[PDB]
Copies of this chain bind each other. A is one copy, B any other.
């Protein structure tokens, strides 16, 4: 049972390089539009305190250098949508997949295609944390890298990368340019709210451990949903809803372990610890696999 990303080819064909002045990052080329973080228009000094509408009105189409491979695409128009810039180019991307823009929920997962200078570097799986950060792997020039899910050859873009917080976690926007979380694209110290653990995902992962022959954490006990949520809240876990219980149905039916019985197991894990034992090779409770992730794998 591995953290598994979606095949990235459909997204690789969409990555381009965007330069304004001496600022360079990645863009996403779909049909005849390139989407990229708006702070590409910023000088270094601008980023410390930008007034984006005022900075953008002072730019011309010819200030935007867009490169796809070695081929320059001419910008023929531009607009700003929240924190994303939409550059109209004079060429349609022939490799545009069927796609949609979606805004995801805390706890959902997605694949990230990390890119530098318009070129793909690596692919990995991420989750939207409850505090709306993501634990990514992003370096200088990675902005404009996107997160996505793939469903029957349709790419659902959900994330575009903008910033790294001092704790090393990452913040970004949906493809309408609205940040996930209370963050904003100004270079100034920003802390995230206290994070919590995605309970439904921990349970899905415990079910994965049982589907793969590991049962040592199970117990003969049971619990009510309300009594479980009291202990979960005490340990900085998110509430478990009845919708969550229903979503875990196929995993419980597959294993014959009632959801509330697995909750009792997690409650004992939380109160007793793991005592140096491991689950699927992990020394800690893993919360970045959704129920759908477990089933698909």
Contacts and interface: CB of A to CB of B under 8 A. Distances in A.
A13 B9 contact: yes
Q: How large is the interface on A (under 10, 10 to 19, 20 to 34, 35 or more residues)?
A: 20 to 34
Nearest to A126: B2
Q: Which of A9, A113, A124 has the most CB of B within 10 A?
A: A9
Given A212-B168, A213-B168, A122 B284 contact: no
A130 interface: no
A52 to B, nearest CB: 31
Interface of A: 1-10, 12-13, 113-114, 120-124, 126, 135-137, 168, 212-213, 278, 281-284, 296-297
Contact of A122 (B5, B121, B212, B281): B5
A168 B1 CA distance: 10
Contacts of A13: 9
Given A13-B9, A283-B283, A123 B4 contact: yes
B5 A297 contact: no
What copy number does this chain have within its complex? 2
B168 A2 contact: no
A74 to B, nearest CB: 25
Given A137-B1, A212-B168, A213-B168, A122 B6 contact: yes
Given A137-B297, A168-B213, A213-B168, A5 B124 contact: yes
A2 B1 CA distance: 15
Q: Which of A121, A213, A281 has the most CB of B within 10 A?
A: A121
Given A212-B168, A297-B137, A122 B7 contact: yes
Contacts of A212: 168
